[PDB]
Amino acid sequence: MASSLSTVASNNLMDFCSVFNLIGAIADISACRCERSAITNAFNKVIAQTTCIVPPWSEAQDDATEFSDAITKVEQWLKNVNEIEIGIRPSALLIGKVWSRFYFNLNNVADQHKTRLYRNAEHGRMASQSNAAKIM
Amino acid sequence: KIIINLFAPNLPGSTKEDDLIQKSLRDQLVESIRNSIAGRNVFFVDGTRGAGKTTFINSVVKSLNSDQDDVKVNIKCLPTIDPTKLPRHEPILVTVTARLNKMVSDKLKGYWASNDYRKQKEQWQNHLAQLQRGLHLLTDKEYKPEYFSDALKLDAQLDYSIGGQDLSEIFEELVKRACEILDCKAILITFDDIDTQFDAGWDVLESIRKFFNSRKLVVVATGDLRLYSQLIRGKQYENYSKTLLEQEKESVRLAERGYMVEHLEQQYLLKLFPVQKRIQLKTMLQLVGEKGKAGKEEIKVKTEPGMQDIDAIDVRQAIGDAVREGLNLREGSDADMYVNELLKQPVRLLMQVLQDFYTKKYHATSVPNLLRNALYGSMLSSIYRAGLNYEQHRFGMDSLCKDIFTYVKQDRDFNTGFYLRPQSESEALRNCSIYLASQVSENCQGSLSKFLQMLLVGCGSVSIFNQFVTELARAENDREKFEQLISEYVAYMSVGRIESASHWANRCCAVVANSPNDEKIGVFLGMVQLNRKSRQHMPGGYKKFNIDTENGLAKAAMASSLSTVASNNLMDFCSVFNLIGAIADISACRCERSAITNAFNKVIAQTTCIVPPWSEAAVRAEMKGSSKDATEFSDAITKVEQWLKNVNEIEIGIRPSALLIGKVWSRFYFNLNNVADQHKTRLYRNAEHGRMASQSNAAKIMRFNVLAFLHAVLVEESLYHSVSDREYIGEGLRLNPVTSVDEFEKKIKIIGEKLKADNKTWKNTHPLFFLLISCPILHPFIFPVGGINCSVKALNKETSFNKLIDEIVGDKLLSDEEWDYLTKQQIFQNTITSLNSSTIVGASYDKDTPAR
Amino acid sequence: LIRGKQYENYSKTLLEQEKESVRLAERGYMVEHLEQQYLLKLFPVQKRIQLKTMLQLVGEKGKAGKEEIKVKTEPGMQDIDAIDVR
Amino acid sequence: SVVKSLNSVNIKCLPTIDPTKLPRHEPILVTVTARLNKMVSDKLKGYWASNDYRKQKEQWQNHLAQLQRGLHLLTDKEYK
RNA sequence: GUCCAGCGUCGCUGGAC
């Protein structure tokens, strides 16, 4: 959840939960395996260390080993990545097509959920009711 | 294997030594020429990024002078130094005959008289006189009828197959005759750059494809294809009929003519310089490879005189030790970014940098001062071109702040441009980034006040300008308004002058207060606008500030943190940036007790600063005019005197870096935004005395403002600081203390436990945090009267926080009776007893605390 | 002076034909780069010496001055009573 | 002032020249060669010791003739 | 506390007792 938080400062701080951040964290973590502290610097790389301004064109429990298991699994995952990814042959077309489907899919989801919030969407079971967890 | 000895016996420039760097490429190209010679033989060597193309070519020329097939080589002919009206056919012809004439004159030594000696010499003279007659048809402008007789005139010898003059054939026989005389296989010609004289290329391009097309000739030309492409395209428009150009210009034929001319040049380049023959010079990064990869051949560098080759260290490690020590950086990823960028530089330049560093360092038995001196003598052109300061002397705090702000302005990066990172599209700017970063670590090394000046003046001015001033006139709309606004800003903040740190703090208060929030409430980025005049109806204990209410040391804190601005009505402010100005001024004393009373009295005063010119109330503010304890301060002077004893012993050994100061501000600046935003609406009507996280007042806002500064110092110093080779925060999420103190004390507890395990004291691992936490000025701000929560869930956190602070400093700041009053007539000498009761302008005390 | 000698190298018929704003920028940089390589090669940076203006020598307001300059306003003035230039 | 300090490791200072107060079409190389000629001729005539100014003078005069022969390259509007 | 006045577009500020 920390990897999916972003703050934008425009007359009021705003908080979003972006899927784009997860792709960033996955891209950031798998950069290297040289150091163990790298895969914990990525979680808190941007969470509370910088602020972004509105673009100009706008019209207006020991608390020290909490990440001993999450780091451990991620560390073991990088072992698999370092071996499988050698035999990867991406193309200029493969990347183009995955974004076309991914972009179209997101735009449909954001439209069929703006009206399915209601009042009792918590514990959402029926497909006609949605909350901030189904959307993400 | 490749070994470079920096301590060469004669100490030559660039330390060429032996084998150069492209020995693999040189032997590869020479092997390629021998294959072809055993129609088109044009080799293009691309010398760019200011490479030593001429040095490489001369290495090839020298190498061919000892050859198995002994293809002799002419001398290099620069086209920009020949006479303008002399055709490029002549220099080769003169070079050929001069080279040939020496050998036949040298045949006398071998043979005083011989049959071939007498026949070859007279045969050669016949060929040259043959060429001179036909040379007339090169620069002539009108065909006189006399030359017709010569064309029909026939020579029974020399075997001229094609009839007529045919100057191409006449040169071919001369070259063929010369090769047999000298006993070679081919004659090689080298063409140098054309950069100085742009137009010299055309008379060379039309000479390669006209007279140099032969089986026994090979050419090697250098330069860049940007000029050649523009040269060919220019000559392809001059054969269009001049009249047609003004007639058929109906916006359709323009496209047709443009499309056709780009077609003719494309087929032209591929005809002369084939793709298969073009060669490119490898850079240092591509030759040693990325770290962790074997890559191409490895290189070793010597570092001390009389150093055994068995101990020579790798070139990547040789630079890595220079940057990390010189820039005061750890072994993290950022330091690897500087070396990777520095590897891409030309070899001849890089070896000059390394030689000027290791030689002086060895002779010194202040590393950053050594590194900066090395870069000045190597990248002096880029420093001058970018516009920064370039005087050999007169280095200090005055110029560094100006250089930083005149670098981000050209980089157009006001967000994160003060980290001084080499990411830029200009080679001049990328060369200036490393030089600027080195200068920062040299200036603010071993001192505390210089560090605080860099945090405020160097980085605060950039961030303040971006958020507030920039919005008035964007750079993309216009350039005269943007450039005008910059010069007014730098004069206002007095960057370069830097009369005092507290002088800067007052101005920064004026700029921030210029743009108000939409709710009209007197809280800002790092300040709260305290009222000056008593209002009408205060529902509770609210009243005027009444600075006289404070005791001996609380008054010293308030007077140090009070500054006023005159815009339309005299405004009073209390800014955390004033406290940093107070610490920066005091810490640079280095004086005895006598001067402390003088300096301490100068810090505390009343200062009024005028509004910046770019505001709408400059004229009214100037028109209205700017107008309207010594016994008890001995204890305050006594405390700061003991603190300054610690500062002098401790600060000698701290190593700030250009990144640590940048990182500290980013965390500090962001935290200031959160506390201003998340306390703006919780004023209420009965919120005095605090005692609840929901209700906040003036005292709570300031306590979390000063605390945020200390918290950012703690976190960003453990992660990034040279004096340690690890970190002690641990594997955990790092947040900020925006509304409760539990986050700040949590990292203190974690660090404390780890340090005892390794038996390391705070004075060796966190010198900065220890110096700032034991500051007598800001102790009363940590525990104000009205800014302490008293909930049963959180009071244990605060009580644990108090004990930890005492242990770090070493003395019990607060007595047991004093603490009891804080959580429930007592006179406090080290606690602000009045600030919680003050009123905030623009705050209407309606409604109440939220229910439940 | 140098930039003027550079534009005389481009074929005139080309300058008057490709008058696009995108092309003007491309030829604008190739000249502002070509002159600097000419100057940085002909007058090396480490050898240039810049003269001093009056403000540098005298100083700003009460700031100490690098040198001392005094002037005389009358033929009868004495060299021991010449006032400062400021 | 710089020239005066140098004039009064040996460096012989040539008289200062300014291209603006010169004939329009006269090349710089001709002016510099003219000023070199005056010093060496003055030095040779004032020298007047032994016969050194009989061997040296011939060598110096030979080089001037060589420079005079190749001067036509500077002031040619076309190749001959 | 109360009275007078001044700046901004109700808020701010000066002064008097």
PDB file of C-alpha atoms (C1' of nucleotides) in Angstrom, chain E residues 2-13:
ATOM      1  C1'   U E   2     -13.367  52.517  25.552  1.00  0.00           C
ATOM      2  C1'   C E   3     -12.956  56.499  22.139  1.00  0.00           C
ATOM      3  C1'   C E   4     -10.866  58.827  17.832  1.00  0.00           C
ATOM      4  C1'   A E   5      -8.390  58.049  13.177  1.00  0.00           C
ATOM      5  C1'   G E   6      -5.583  55.347   8.925  1.00  0.00           C
ATOM      6  C1'   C E   7      -4.588  50.666   5.089  1.00  0.00           C
ATOM      7  C1'   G E   8      -6.830  46.691   2.262  1.00  0.00           C
ATOM      8  C1'   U E   9     -11.611  44.375   0.308  1.00  0.00           C
ATOM      9  C1'   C E  10     -15.238  42.589   7.095  1.00  0.00           C
ATOM     10  C1'   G E  11     -10.206  42.187   8.387  1.00  0.00           C
ATOM     11  C1'   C E  12      -5.805  44.671   9.682  1.00  0.00           C
ATOM     12  C1'   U E  13      -2.876  48.959  11.966  1.00  0.00           C
TER      13        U E  13
END
